[PDB]
């Protein structure tokens, strides 16, 4: 009908527990395309798990979860499906689901979120292989409505791809819902999104840019690489009012 993906709702589970987070798909087809989960703790804020291919069911995972959260999806339904086993307080945190084109490696569209709470009480309240970390500042930009706003993403290591382009993202999440994509591949304005946002740099150092900062882009940006898995979020920055 129209794109939207349906995440089930709050979890409260006490250690030891597992979960099976739902996430039902609809606007588009299950199959083709690769649906992408996000761990989100405040105080880490996002972090990829895994990916998963509906259509060969195919999995990937985030050396850092896999082994404790297992991608199946079921498609009669539209639905994918991610469970966390030998829950810990550790898990706390809110859970993403996350489309992922292939001409941009991006993620479009978004769930509206699951938040899990481990806890015991009922009621609410060796050598390796060095990923790329993105380096974001600076990490709040307090503003007076109307002045421009420039942010830097630094990636440890060089984001072009073998093809010629260059997946560095940046993402807007406004405090309540999921992160929202504003700039793909750099520079290029995602379907919406307003134009006096505009992205730029290369190699290492990016920038987004807004001439003139409004109201209704008050938030937390993100920048992501993803011509490297892991799929690496920056820091964040958070852009208020003074």
């Known amino acids: 009908m129209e794109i939207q993906l349906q995440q089930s709702g709050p979890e409260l589970v006490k250690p030891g527990a597992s979960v099976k987070i739902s996430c039902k798909a609809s606007?588009?087809?299950?199959?083709?395309?690769?649906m992408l989960w996000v761990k989100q703790s405040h105080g880490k804020s996002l972090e990829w798990i895994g990916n998963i291919n509906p259509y060969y069911g195919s999995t990937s995972y985030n050396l850092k979860f896999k082994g404790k959260a297992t991608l199946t999806v079921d498609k009669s339904s539209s639905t994918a499906y991610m469970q966390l086993n030998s829950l810990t307080s550790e898990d706390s945190a809110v859970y993403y689901c996350?489309?992922?084109?292939?001409?941009?490696?991006?993620?479009?569209?978004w769930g509206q979120g699951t938040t899990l709470t481990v806890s015991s009480a009922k009621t609410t309240g060796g050598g390796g292989g060095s990923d790329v970390v993105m380096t974001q500042t600076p990490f709040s930009l307090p503003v007076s409505l109307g002045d421009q706003a420039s942010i830097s993403c630094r990636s440890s290591q060089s984001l072009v791809h073998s093809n010629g382009n260059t997946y560095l993202h940046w993402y807007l999440q406004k405090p309540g819902q999921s992160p929202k994509l504003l700039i793909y591949?750099?520079?290029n304005r995602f379907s919406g999104v307003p134009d006096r946002f505009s992205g730029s740099g290369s190699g290492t150092d990016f920038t987004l840019k807004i001439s003139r900062v409004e109201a209704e882009d008050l938030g937390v940006y993100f920048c992501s690489q993803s011509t490297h898995v892991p799929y690496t979020f920056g820091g964040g920055t958070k852009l208020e009012i003074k």
């Open positions: 606007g588009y087809s299950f199959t083709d395309y690769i």
């Open positions: 996350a489309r992922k084109n292939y001409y941009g490696s991006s993620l479009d569209y």
């Open positions: 591949k750099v520079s």
